[PDB]
Write a structure and sequence with these properties.
The structure is cut from a larger assembly and holds six copies of chain A.
Chain A lengths: L10
Subcellular location (chains C, E): Host cytoplasm
Family (chains C, E): Belongs to the Phikzvirus chimallin family.
Protein name (chains C, E): Chimallin
Chain lengths: 10, 522, 22, 522, 22, 10
């Protein structure tokens, strides 16, 4: 799994 | 589909979304009113993201503010999801096998799964096309859904506060991207002979979000500036002497030992971290400074204060006497008695509770502090594990000088750990007022089920069984809440629980203490 | 296999006490 | 503070008080409407006292009317405090020691402590600067706070009555300062063959203040003019024949005698003193004339009338049978029985109640009659003890001729005595309607706690223990009210209890009787 | 020391009866 | 203690 999302840092 | 175009009966039915246009009109009126009263500046735009002509799960409202940096346009967006109760999204099917029989499980879809990478890509492309800048850079500022079952006709204050906070967040992210002076504790000395004091508090009514969402909070730790000089003037008048606020509540976990160490261990869960109301700025270096106050709750075992019985009333939901059900004696210890007092309450806590607590956080990718919760979730584990840890270390170094390496070594030491637990977010209407769904914990379940240990053990396994599939655990947790709490439960989102490293908290506290920070209290 | 408890929560435990100026 | 000026994010949040501007607008509209209907005269002004730009605990509304006396301007002010529930004032900390351990007590701040000398000085300076007269003399007319949890949108009648009463009070104080004819009973003869009659009354529903605040009242004594001539015309029509009204209720106190004198003594508490609705004038000499009616309640032991059981219903809160719990027989005397009647009710009262009552008053520095309550509190004891007594004697001499020295000697005889008791003022919402917090008395506590004498004794000591600190007594009293009454208690102010001199009441009554006053009744 | 009652309320007591014309 | 307040009489 380990779904991710948008990040402003990178 | 083609059937309507094949027969073409006069008149039109359905085929529209009516919870977007009204919200847009309300937001435009609120923005005009705020601009009239010299509260904001006419430099941002409000746009509608219709699901019908973009083919997305949920319509959204986006607040875009753009500036120019070295000739390169930069756009900051704060989408606001608008879930609707009049339409049903298709569910997700999963299959599990038991012996010789296979069955299908119908799950449910939350707001968090809707906001995927493709959703943000389409939103960014739409904003770029609308604003006339095709190649402009777009940076996210943190989504915040508007909960359903909320009447927009009589909720003007919450919407106004949400709009102002969204503008503040856009300004914050734009300033961070541009590059400004980092916030450091070296500038907090004030050079006026004042000191910082931390006050602990025990509460019984839940805290409220900016949109009226209740939040469970039993222990509240705040930090204030004490400026009491000799002949202090302004008696009974105080000038906003308050900086931070952290809401905490404790929960009990049982280690698997068969039957000198205490059977139960107390784990403290951090729900909300926020700054003072007066402060309109939110920067990454304030978050760690506010979070450092959590460790201070162990100065005098203040985490155990809510556990002691109150005199006069007994809700019987947070009773501590149920802990004796599995003790050496089968029955429960009877509080609310003339003989019972603090004399043997300490004895009970020594003989059945571990002296040291455990610190945990309920990270939420859709909350107000989404931009930090997502970063910490990435730092916990995933493809972006080194970058997040490096960013966190850099921020901590920027807050308070430098030289954090002497206390921590991120190269060979995990910062955050994922326990593989998913927590539902909802609210249930109690007889008196609306409350929080997280009021149901291990102690509450133990109180509800007096002597049947097997049912309680099934409930406990429904939370953290690694063998059982997560969908079944969510189903069991949703059934148990209905069984115990009531029929008024209304889920609103999802959250994840994580455990901080034991050495990390101590290293952070020691680094801040050595960096010239002095806090005094009882 | 039946669940018995959390065997990993005990690895992370605060050893010290909060340091305050008082 | 400086953090906001250091980062300067666009947009503004909080930083304002919204319960002052709306009240000012409402008061201006009400004043305009009253002036339009030829109800008042355009000679007074309404001003706002903002806490933000004056640095005070609470914002206030002031009604100033100014006149000229011998070329010297005189300004009369009636401030109206505006407490708000959206902000919390800092609490007051106190330390007490028990053996080898010291602890900190967090008290609470009332409206009365806010209105200090510095507050009035700043208010007077602000009014003088605003009205253009720097050296004008300013005289107080009596503060009156507006209770919180009151919706101003639908309370127009109470605000209108409060404004008219405030204007009347300003006129009264201005006329008193200017100097007018004192009110004397010699002008009450009427020279038309009429007589004054006093009517006693027993009530069960609480009286109401000008702002809807309930007041406990069991015995009501009124004075009327009876003008029944021979062929009286106007059948069924009455012309405002009513002058005074005094609200009284009795309470039982137990003398400390170990176990022929009765164990319990009855003490009568005077709550409210007021004139007729038709009379728009309030002068100091009417207050004593109205207060003289209190002693007349003992003509036929009318103070014991509310104690007798009512037929048909039994609230079980004011039951007199609980008095037998500590009697020679442990159990309680069972009323509501066929055999029980007035035949042995008199026997019980003779054998367990002292024949003579005790008179007490609940002085309040923030009530409607603040200007007299403060004077009596000063006369009770303090730096201004001789001046207040001399003023009271002068007023009593002015009312009814003179020669009060033959009945009283203020030089070597105290007028009022302070018992060192502080009474909270609040209201609790009963199931049917809102009631008064003072309904809970010694008999109510005795009824609530059937046989446990120790708990009742602890409650009784929580009121008048001289050894225990006052803050602890207030804490215990606030806990007991929550324990017994309910969760709807809402405190509004503070009051003090005082005991009149036994000889003073008799001397006043005899002086009025000898001064040509004749009152007849049953 | 435990509270037992009010030892000063008994000093102030009305001796007479209300005088009315009737 | 014996806290006091403004008085119009004096």
């Amino acid at each position: 799994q380990y779904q991710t999302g948008p990040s402003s840092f990178y | 589909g083609g059937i309507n175009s094949q027969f073409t009966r006069s008149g039109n039915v359905q085929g529209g979304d009516a919870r977007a246009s009204e919200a847009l009109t309300v937001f435009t009126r609120l923005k005009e009113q705020a601009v009239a009263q010299q509260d904001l500046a006419d430099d941002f735009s409000i746009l509608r993201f219709d699901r019908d002509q973009h083919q997305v799960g949920w319509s959204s409202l986006v607040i875009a503010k753009q500036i120019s940096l070295n000739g390169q346009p930069v756009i900051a967006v704060r989408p606001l999801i608008l879930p609707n109760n009049s339409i049903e999204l298709p569910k997700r099917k999963t299959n599990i096998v038991n012996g010789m029989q296979t069955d299908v499980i119908e799950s449910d879809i939350d707001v968090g799964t809707v906001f995927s990478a493709q959703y943000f890509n389409r939103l960014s492309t739409y904003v770029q096309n609308t604003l006339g800048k095709p190649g402009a850079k777009v940076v996210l500022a943190g989504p915040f859904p508007i909960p359903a079952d909320l009447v927009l006709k009589d909720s003007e204050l919450q919407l106004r506060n949400l709009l102002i906070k969204s503008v503040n967040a856009c300004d914050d992210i734009l300033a961070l991207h541009s590059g400004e002076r980092p916030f450091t504790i070296a500038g907090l000395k004030g050079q006026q002979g004042e000191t910082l004091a931390a006050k602990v508090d025990i509460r019984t009514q839940p805290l409220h979000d900016t949109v009226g969402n209740p939040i469970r909070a039993d222990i509240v730790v705040t930090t204030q500036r004490v400026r009491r000089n000799g002949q202090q003037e302004n008696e009974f008048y105080e000038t906003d002497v308050k900086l931070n606020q952290v809401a905490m509540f404790t929960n009990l976990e049982r280690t698997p030992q068969a039957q000198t160490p205490a059977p139960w261990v107390a784990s403290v869960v951090i729900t909300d971290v926020r700054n003072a109301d007066g402060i309109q700025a939110n920067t990454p270096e304030m978050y760690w400074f506010a979070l450092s106050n959590a460790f201070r709750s162990t100065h005098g075992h203040a985490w155990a204060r809510p556990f002691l019985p109150m005199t006069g009333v007994a809700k019987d939901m947070k009773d501590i006497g149920a802990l004796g059900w599995m003790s050496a004696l089968r029955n429960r210890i009877d509080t609310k008695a003339a003989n019972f007092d603090d004399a043997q309450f300490g004895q009970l806590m020594l003989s059945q509770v571990q002296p040291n607590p455990v610190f945990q956080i309920d990270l939420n990718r859709m909350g107000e502090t989404a931009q930090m919760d997502s970063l910490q979730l990435d730092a916990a584990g995933g493809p972006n594990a080194q970058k997040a840890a490096a960013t966190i270390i850099r921020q901590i170094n920027n807050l308070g000088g430098g030289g954090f390496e002497r206390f921590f070594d991120h190269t060979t030491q995990p910062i955050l750990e994922r326990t593989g637990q998913v927590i539902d977010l909802g609210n249930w209407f109690d007889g008196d007022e609306k409350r929080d769904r997280r009021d149901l914990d291990n102690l509450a379940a133990l109180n509800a089920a007096e002597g049947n240990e097997n049912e309680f053990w099934g409930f406990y396994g429904a939370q953290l069984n690694p063998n059982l599939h997560p969908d079944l655990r969510n189903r069991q947790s949703r059934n148990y809440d209905r069984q115990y709490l009531g029929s008024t439960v209304t889920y609103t989102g999802k959250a994840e629980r994580c455990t901080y490293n034991a050495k990390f908290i101590e290293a952070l506290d020691r680094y801040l203490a050595e960096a010239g920070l002095q806090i005094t209290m009882d | 296999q039946r669940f018995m408890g959390n065997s990993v929560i005990g690895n992370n435990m605060v050893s010290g006490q909060a340091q305050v100026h008082s």
